[PDB]
Amino acid sequence: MSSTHTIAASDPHIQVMGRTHINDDASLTFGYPGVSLSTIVAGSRLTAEMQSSNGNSWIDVIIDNHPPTSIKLDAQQQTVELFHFPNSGEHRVEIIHRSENWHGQVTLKQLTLTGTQFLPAPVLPQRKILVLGDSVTCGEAIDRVAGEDKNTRWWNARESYGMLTAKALDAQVQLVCWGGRGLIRSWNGKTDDANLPDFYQFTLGDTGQAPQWDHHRYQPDLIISAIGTNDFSPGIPDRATYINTYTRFVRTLLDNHPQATIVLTEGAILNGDKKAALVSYIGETRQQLHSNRVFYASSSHHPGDNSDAHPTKDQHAAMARELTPQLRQIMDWLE
């Protein structure tokens, strides 16, 4: 007999890495980039019911070891074919959110397998990393192509330095980042957007009605904070103000994640005086913290290219190569 088997997105057969909101109909909604949902199945066809809030969100779909397929999701619910073969076999399926919150939020409602069964969920690594930051952490402009107007297709989470670093360290990762945002102000000088200490609390979104992320749902071994580019965009911010708020934020992290090691870094975009100032502010933050759980990693500036100052795909690869060795020493993950 031919049979189908449909499960909700929130079902134990679907592995989830990254922040998701569980809706009352057992669908999952997510906004941060890098959110990864995976399943292993025995069958010939697998489809998903998906939608995005603004029709401006992208995902990657990876079947077994094949090249990924990037798909832009319509604002209306649509059946998305993940794979289809003439015969049944065992297949691994991964969906990766490429977009970030301002692009919209994506919802996966349910999956339908034509075949025999969903197998046990893919097993994730034991090690867990959380990366906090701005659009560089979010993977903005990694997939740029010369000649195109920037659009939401340019974002790539899998090839961002945070995901490459986690992969090298055999670790899970959550990316909690928002383009244009800072620790205390946005690139445009505005101080009353949700800053990093605000959106760090949200499962997705950033309005008065954004759902609170329960930290018990992901307790990282390592937290990297790479925030700062946008705080320095208008000019170098006031030293006491910045250091006092960075200190207060890392105190929140330390208290929320009692087992975590925290690594602060200025990121790749700032250069020259602005870079040196943020490095300085980080050193003084650490001095005020007096914590044997808080460390620093140095990094190079990467200039982007003629089309966009955001670091390129090859620069993100370089960034992971520079950061990873320092993280091994800090975490004793000499692996």
Numbering used by the authors: 7 to 341
Task: Please give sentences taken from the publication describing this entry.
CE2 enzymes are acetyl esterases (that are generally not appended to other catalytic modules), which are reported to be active on synthetic aryl-esters and acetylated xylan. Here we report the biochemical properties and crystal structure of several CE2 members, both single-module CE2 enzymes and CtCE2, a component of CtCel5C-CE2.
CjCE2A is a canonical serine hydrolase, with a classical Ser-His-Asp triad, in which Ser-160 is the catalytic nucleophile, His-335 activates the serine, and Asp-333 makes a hydrogen bond with Nδ1 of His-335 thus completing the catalytic triad. The oxyanion hole, which stabilises the incipient tetrahedral transition-state, comprise the N of Ser-160 and Gly-205 and the Nδ2 of Asn-255. Based on their catalytic efficiencies, CtCE2 and CjCE2B exhibit a significant preference for acetylated glucomannan over xylan, whereas CjCE2A and CjCE2C do not distinguish between the two polysaccharides. Thus, Tyr-665 in CtCE2 is conserved in the C. japonicus esterases (Trp-231 in CjCE2A and Tyr-206 in CjCE2B), while Trp-335 in CjCE2B is equivalent to Trp-790 in the Clostridium enzyme. To address this issue Tyr-683 and Trp-127, which are located in or at the interface, of the CBM-like domains of CtCE2 and CjCE2A, respectively, were mutated and the activities of the two esterase variants were assessed. It would appear, therefore, that the CBM-like domain contributes to substrate recognition in CjCE2A, but its role in the catalytic activity of CtCE2 is less evident.
